[model samples]
Target: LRYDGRVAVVTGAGAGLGREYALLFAERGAKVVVNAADIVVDEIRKAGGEAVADYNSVIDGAKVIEILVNNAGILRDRSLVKTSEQDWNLVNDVHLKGSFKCTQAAFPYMKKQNYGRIIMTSSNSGIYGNFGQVNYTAAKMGLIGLANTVAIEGARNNVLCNVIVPTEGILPDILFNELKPKLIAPVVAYLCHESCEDNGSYIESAAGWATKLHMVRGKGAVLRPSLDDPVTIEYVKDVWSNVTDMSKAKHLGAIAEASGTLLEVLEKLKEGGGDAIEDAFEFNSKELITYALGIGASVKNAKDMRFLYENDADFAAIPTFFVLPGLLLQMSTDKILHGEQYLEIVDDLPTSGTLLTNGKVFDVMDKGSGAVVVTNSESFDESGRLLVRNQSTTFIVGDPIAGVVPLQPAPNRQPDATVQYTTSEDQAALYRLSGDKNPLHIDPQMALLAGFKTPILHGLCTLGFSVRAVLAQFADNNPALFKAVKVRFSGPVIPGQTLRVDLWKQGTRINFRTVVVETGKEVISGAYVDLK
Candidate 1:
């Protein structure tokens, strides 16, 4: 009931039923106090959930207790004659004494505000009695008496007190296997509601059924003023039939109606004794009951109703792909390497010159496909972690067969056959997703301030492209063998410049290096790879 902005204190809430209650309260938009001896606040925060764990600090933690469900209890099932002193004390501490201390702590605020809901956890063993459960039974019954006293004392202040004597089929499996735990939460929630005016009442709840158990007086026996020896065993036996009238019994509605009409009957008796209200009264027929049946039914229906978002596409917006950085690079590398244009690179150096020279430079065009290269020279200042770069080059070959057609042996190759290339855009976006977004690659002002003409590429991105070259070597055959690849970022490859990645393979391992062909600069030095 209007739990938003409300606070709930659930003791022993680290796990089990307590954990469930705390989560439910939090999911419903309530700030929860997960009061447990063991702390699990980190676990909650890691899962993007909110919770505050109070181990020993609950005694000195938040002072306000708006809704107190004294569900924190322990069981010590033992016969009175065979039970030890320690066992009785242990049960008393958790079930009776703990309940008393918590209730006492909450009473001041409740009295000041003139509003509170106190529920004591009672059980069937206490009400109906159970074998070999002396300690548990006694504690359960004592809770009832405690509720009764508090109900009377706090009634004027709007503080309501109630006892829940859950039966064999009304609680969790650990406590009562026959009962469904689902039935218990609604009853507890209802008892904590402001509209529940019931006080000092014991509810027999199990399997969606909630009924009250109360004391009542039967109809009186017929007697005469002149009778001397009117009573006999046979007369008593005959009167039993009329005494045990099920139709005349008082239910919750019946009793409440009778109690309300009692005031009117009392006035009648004061005015005229013999002409007073009728003594023979029927409880159910008068309708003086407040049934929790409808409330419980509604709760069950709500629990069963599943929302569309739970199983639909709009369940929750999520990332399109879930691959980590390394894996993503491997996929992109394979895609670019296996194209028909790259197939022109043979087992020999036929097109090596043309491939090195005409190959598209590491620039905006290549980075658009979600791949980027970073160099040690550029990432050093930003990451404070650098690598060695000798020389490196990147390419986006538009015509794989044509791109390899012009490449000939070193002796037959000419210098003017290639065009020096560079990456002018998409460098920042490429490195960011690749997990190395060195500011030098994106921050042009910082680059000039750092005494460089322009921003440099990250060496890791070059290593990634080197891996792509290896993938190109064995595109159609045994591609999966290209695994377990790692490279050192030695030198920097600047944007808008042509560089070459000299690649070679021995068995499953691949060795690659990049060189800026323009000034013969070893841009990415000492790069190598070992396949799976």
Candidate 2:
């Protein structure tokens, strides 16, 4: 059953299942083209098999030949409502359209040569929709239709198209021991073999079980009594079980029937205030500099340039830059204001890299007319080290609520240290570029309407200044010694206002508050910082 002269192409050969297919085909003597980059080609070559490589994004990822397994996909796993339009288009185009284009392009060659075999990779998402995977499910089901149609047309010649639904991954720890990707490889190999006879088939394998799947009509009830007797709606209702009941038969497409809708399933996930989301935040020095200046990091001081410049010998991120990813939370309201912020540093911020963060709402409180939502986010670097965790408190303002909570009252003693600096007049203008673009930060009309002066600096910006002052005074200008900071915004800092940070060191803990130098008004209070 070896593919002696056939040219087999495998998509996503750099990754798991597709790589297995590429290796298997090449090992069986088919000339292989790996859709991805290297790795597989070297292995096949060393194994005395002919193989080549072509790296192209799968949107335009089709180059057809003899045996083609158009098996490649990436997950944009989100609920229907949460999924963006771009996500749907990208996921569907890559899976459905990529496979379609690949098979469509392969048609002419196979029609001429009189031999072809196409395998479309599908998952349970296609057959039984999973929670929060609408985009993936649609794209996979679309592949099944494409494969079925291709099978019909290709059958005209010595060609065939089928779906191989391999089950593995995203499993519990115990299931991983029994379920694996390699175990399903033989089913795919059999269909790809030259002597294979299956066409327009769906063969799903896992745990050494190869099962074929297809639609089955339920045993129906004769609702129409005679030619003149019309079928009543109540009659259909009476036989509803017979119409959809797979019990007298067991079978299943309707998404809700397979798995609950987005919000419906979300309730199950939100049981313990669990609304989970993870995303990669790619950034460079551009982001770091944007935030450094946004928070009024000094541009002229040679010492401060470490935060603003990339080439400085002591170049590093102003730890608060990690807050930038908080913008990805995707929460919104007509008038939501940042009420409080708490950030814990687990490691020194990298000068530049992609960070993956898992964020979830920790608590939600009804403030009568408004709602207070507290969210917790943990950021990890590419190496998977936990770099930082932020708990952000947001107030969605309407009528407001009863003002009550624990207050970190300053000790009845003289402050141990004090640092003062004048905020730049354009502070809000610069900080807004870092992602916080609320009109209250810049637009004067918007500010006056809300009973504010012109524009006010971002509360986080002031937090940054206060934290930086503490790091300098205690950590000796070392961001590495930073452990955590929790602050409450009691008031605002008008741009150009001179601000003072008063600190009372309590062992490893520093009790702190910030005030306006001229007005002697506390702008930030109830704050504490922990240092290593």
Candidate 3:
């Protein structure tokens, strides 16, 4: 009877039934939406009735669907053989497709609220086919089936759907007056009202009269009189009386409408992972020096030669050289920023020797869509002394432990110090010789597949540069006080980009982050170090 607070839609309400429906709802205090009918809205607005201007664009406001009358339609009156392609498509577009689109948009909100009313307009021509009006009748007929199907699916959600078969009587003057706008809109409004309990009803009305109808067919007669002669024309004709039995008609209803990898991974993440993965790599002085140079240790600077020349008296592996074991240990990051990494120096790393690595998957977390995988390792000299310890946290992209202890945020004030380093264009190609040979860092096509503009610099290479910057500035270029370091890769760096390291000091601890000098894009963060 009334809609005190509701948003209703009546498509094609420019002049006739559409306008009538909007006005009815407006007076009943329903906030209404009418199609391009500023005229309809003006009438409501003029009367102090509420209506939103063109809100049906799915433009992101208002909970919709107290009413969605799928009433837009067009006529393409032509016999099947004479119908033009454009005409058939045009008619269907306005009638069938329009109805479907509007209903679909409304249904979700309706289901959420657990109450909705929808009506698809049909006609007698649709029920009893009209000559030369094939396209019209077909589209109108589609509404009937559409309503049927919608009613079935929406039933569980209490979203009632029905077809309204409106009519135009034989004469235009008196007959059109009898089936005027007032009569049709009232039925639709009543159907939409909360008190109307019926769903999936077919209501046909004309001349101020209305009634419900149903889709039905006679009970099909079984044809198993004899298995040997189970279905001849004679037998079918003999049972024609029963076959045509409309008396026993019945209603028909329409037809019915990975994941463990993560679970399996979660089990592996917490329960069984991090087993000591034993690996031994015999890297002589040559290998250590090569690895050092691969990360851009200077050949010209005498102080930097400790990494380039393994025989120097104070020569020690760049602390991050410890990462090679995990890289060599065959462990893994990912759309995946190197996310983050942690390496604790257990002892001074040997410039050369058969380094025995005990590497294993450390942390695996199920984050939102992706997982954060971490692997940590420790390397031992041939003499069995614990030479270096490293833990690598990789958020390929998840979340029991909030992933890596969140990257320590960069200091608010200016860096206590900063350093710059430029990587070679062939950084990854050379870095690959150090151990990690992921094609993602070397192959162009592969890098593209991984969603990078170009082959990315290795995460460890970035780590090496970061630690070296800290060592140079804070440790007086000494390895002894470089006790531990943690870093998270927040973004990627294409090889050859200049890195600007920002450093902050708190007691013996140094907080730092790396950014691309050219872009000011933070490439590494949540990084810090503890000294002796």
Candidate 4:
């Protein structure tokens, strides 16, 4: 690839694969800006290559350029449990935010020139996740999404973008000769070439061989209702193999294509089809007390002591405890982002009970960029008496069955009262003891992987803390007076942040919202509590 008049910016080009790429581009007659902590201008000049070393970080070097190779990254290898906040932020800032800043800065220049080629460095860990690399995998996979959107937006200006995943394994010095960094440089060079037509593509290269990666979707089955009966979980269980079989799968290149599948399924659902499932679990006083303490409900207060002391005759469960029944829905928790939750308590929550929970998909709303799935669940006492009803709204990122509805707007009104609570730094770590080990909480790297700046407090944990605030302010810490609670999780709450719960009271009905004290950002909104 001979570039006679191109100015290329290669990040982290001091050594390794970046150095090889900078050298190759410089050799091809392109003016290269080598970005790294250590300068390599002399090395490139000695090799008869045109190059200038720029010690600025990638975030600072995002100036006008024709070519950008986002090859800067660092690894903080630790289990999610051991990774710290600093470790998570460093990796995220260096890789994910750095790539974003550089690309955003270079985009205007590329558009003005009407041409550009951008190559993002991805990895096998990002493609197929690794155990100890939560932060690395997150940043890498994020680059793929970034490239996808950039290719779409920049196509008009002939600015192409692609991701390169180098699949070489680390080996001992004696075996290093088999897989050299130079072998990967050719692929990067080709991707950065003006003549290359590939855009929003993922190419895996190693040992002089290259192949493309694709997102594939299977022809999943639609569990529809029949003339004799409605669609049930049993029906889905019967056809589970067909739903997951990849024999008739197809590749999807854009978000629109994935969203189209939801429309197809929605049409099928409209023809009278659905699925349902039921689950049963027993919770004793021990579980209730554990949940209480998980949210920082201490025994210091006399009323709160009732929940912590299992033997207390006045022991009772909190109103928000009903939300747990909604977890019975058999779906991938990873695919469902909690949007809103509403729980209605028809009777007092028992401190110890055998609960039968039944859940069904009530509706799915298409939000263009994503989908909203509403699931309804009911928990009954051992005698089959309805104890609580729970409604959960989840935002599915890609696609789902569709029914158009206007998005719910944020609530606007004056507050009647405000209550505040500051969660401990280890809130999430402590909350996980309640059996909700989603890893996104308490794991710094996992949080980064999930597109968060740091591990966040569990939504329910926040809800629990917020409810405790409500009980203290309105109901005088009486758990029996609590009847219902509803709230939308507008954003995540990082641990150690003080939360201010604003309330608008109207008789027995109280409207509420929770805001982060430091950022003045609303984390929980459209909230309400009904008291006896």
Candidate 5:
């Protein structure tokens, strides 16, 4: 396929079959994404191939992926008698659920463009049951169903889908060697090609042989109209000859075709002109039952009719009075917290702290036999609201202690004490490597425009400093005991100033406060840590 402007996502592409797929796609002019939890993506890039490290990274890349080769597969093969829940679930998760998640994430862009291809990896073990491979077989079969459904749904959007079942022969090591380039790549390439028309079809490749696999329908006995009498094997045996012979039969379009015989009577009546019909041929058929209460008849017809009859309404035109109830009763957008919202009165320090200007507790609910609280607060103005919102209780008693920890190893460790740090020229460089790259840290002009008066270090840099310091001391450099850390950006820590961090330990948790050494004013407060 000529994929000059196409993008592709290949899971488990760090090694084995997936790696080859990633490289080939990249070589063919497509922007190949190598998705694997491992760090092998660096090796691929170093080797002159385009690859991303994670599935989330690929989704956030903002590229329209025209091709998705779900080549990731994990085999947790075990007999049903010996299988454990973990084994079954792991195989299912990696092969089936992982594929589902990755595919779902890519769907938005594919739907927007209305042109894409999805190639799933299935197996013969799933198509025709294999012994001692219950988990693998189930996952493989699940992929087939997923591929088939995507094929049908993607039809209107010019998107094609297919499944590939590879039985044996080639090995992973040989893929990058002599037999690598052409063996598996061509099968997937054709499926991803613009000329491909085999949507929902299965193709098998093994030992240099390839062909489409067809699921054929066999004929079955036609039941009699009488429902009160017992249905027996004798009745089945009587129609054995008709059941075996399907030469006169055509492809049955749907389940309704089983009762097409009912239409036969109507056809015969129509052939007889005016003589064959009286009182509408008084009939009681199960096909009518099927239309009424059986299978997919109601779902399909009702949805089609509803869409045909009802006019679609815009969000703003929707009744706000009615919508307001859901926002309050169901805890929709109204119950979300704002960063600086005030807290309610009736709490003490550590529990009911000062009524701060940041972090709103917008909701509280009863959990089980007792009251439970959820603090779904954040710093970013544009961040999505957390699911569990809780109010902050404000009630402070004693003189509030300053809890700061310096960003260095303590030569003189003091109980309930603060530590200090001085910044170097390399601080800004180290901060940049930690992820955030705010221009205020680098550009003096941008810093002045923001009313900073001068360039200032990022709040996250100080956060990282506290994180790095805690990781060095308490956990013996493990950093695991510092289970969770959250801090609000209180003030700027300008360069060329000494910074002090105070710490207050309470059992397994630690609360912290930070201040600029020169001014001795609180730069950051209400910082806390959960110890493991």
Candidate 6:
């Protein structure tokens, strides 16, 4: 567990768990950056340990470093009814936003070095739930989701991420006598070690004890229904026990693993799973230009104007514009959550033409917590030649009885190049004009009702930003050379956050992923692009 030449950043190192981590890492031969505007640095120096004091807040102090321990946090204990806006924001700003900012700052340096380790501090309260700490629970659980994506995106670069949940409360020295912070330091050290292979994992640690947590799946029965006799609330009630049964549950590491059962059920419910449905739509110059601007495309780069100005004969639609057509397939928008998407282009999309789209249910799986449906669609020109193809997965929130199967693994490769981009806070509002008016992306009240802190940027908007990065790096900003793109939506992006797109190139085929720069959370994963 030694870290001889490594540089580690420990937030809130002035006291508690953070202080213990800093001391342990220093003793193990690591240079430690102590992010607390207090006297801990002097103590460490007096102990003959290598340490530097950083008085800045976590939002401003995170910098490019090899190792990061996001241990900074504060507690504003109060029942949800008694919590004030100030109380909620204060706790959230320090715990959630702080971790995000630090992770973002350190990722580039980690990617450059081709090695790194990141640890996030979470709690049992967050994992399960607790009274008088709604804000703290929300922020803490958010870190777990953040670590999940970080682990996925950093896997190729040998950058590992894991969440550490301390069993003891954030109490004073006297209260901590029974559960010493030093007892948990070993687990953090092991996770931060270069030899550590665990990624996207969560562990609970106490006085010399530790245990791991995992999301599990269960086998369930499916209720087959035809269009004439749709599934109803009464029918669901009758089969509730079957859906709730978890007697044969097994752990699932990725979203795809839990979706196989749902796919099986969907196939049996429709005629070839709705493959017979052919829908037609038309897109013209106005739509293309709107989509270009919606994704933050600029006319400043004269070369990019081809996507912005239809008057220019060279004007062409960006490859991602084809994503909209895939949405023509009938599905339950209220219950379904977009999980991942893949697209392939056989020919350049026409600037304005009537196109027909055909969709089929690809797969469905039963996760203990939800159902996932995977579907594929193809768009064709009037002449009948295939132009583009798309595959997408949707997560239906809630436990449903369905069949099961195994999932395929994603490609593994080191990033050859990386690019960063910043989205405007108003990005979703602008992107909505392109025909996706999902209230989740624009209405604050709507977002709240849907269980978010605030309005989130559209997943497609982030996709567009990712494509722009690919076009810039590989296609030389040439829209025509673009051929295909694929991605898994690991998390959501709040507006105004910066994004980092990690890319790997092997000849004309490129593998890629994107993350929120501020939190190290992979918003997109298992992504790639194919060029002509």
What are the root-mean-square deviations of the candidates from the true structure over C-alphas?
34.6, 19.2, 27.6, 25.6, 31.9, 26.3
lDDT of 1 at 470: 49
Residue 338, model 2: lDDT of 78
lDDT of candidate model 4 versus the reference? 0.80
lDDT (Cα, 0-100) at 129 in candidate 3:
90
lDDT of each: 0.49, 0.79, 0.77, 0.80, 0.54, 0.81
Q: How accurate is candidate 6 locally (lDDT)?
A: 0.81
Clashes of each: 39, 2, 5, 2, 14, 13
Q: Can you write out model 2's per-residue Cα lDDT over 299-349, one digit (the tens) per residue?
A: 775557888888988888878888767556434322167788888788667
> What is candidate 1's lDDT per residue for 1-532, written digit by digit as tens?
5466455667656765556556666655666667743354565565556667666322332342426666666777877688999878777777776777777788767778888777787887888788988888788888887777877788899888888766644656654553565566667667766678887888777766788777555433332212333556776677677556555444443336657755643453444343111222111201111111100111233321211123422221111001111222322322222111111111211100101011112222344544432111111111222211111223334322221212111222232122223443554445444333446666888767755667766554444444444443443213233333434344566755566666654455455555766668765444444455
341: Cα error in model 5, Å:
98
Q: Give the least accurate 10-residue stretch of model 4, judged by summed lDDT.
A: 401-410
Q: What's the candidate order when arranged by decreasing lDDT?
A: 6, 4, 2, 3, 5, 1
Question: Which prediction has more favorable lDDT, 5 or 6?
Answer: 6
Better of 2 and 3 by lDDT: 2
Instruction: Name the runs in model 3 displaced over 4 angstroms.
Output: 1-276, 332-337, 396-406
Per-residue alpha-carbon lDDT of candidate 5 for residues 232-335, written as tens digits (9 for 90 to 100) = 78877886886776553445433466576566444533443221111100112222222112111122333222112223221011000111111122232222
Residues 71-100, model 6: lDDT tens digits: 999989999899999899988888888888
Question: Residue 431 of candidate 3: its Cα lDDT?
Answer: 82
Clash count, predicted structure 4: 2
Query: lDDT: which candidate is best?
Result: 6
Scanning candidate 3 in windows of ten residues, the lowest lDDT window is: 57-66
Best of the two (3, 6) by TM-score: 6
By TM-score, how accurate is candidate 3? 0.46
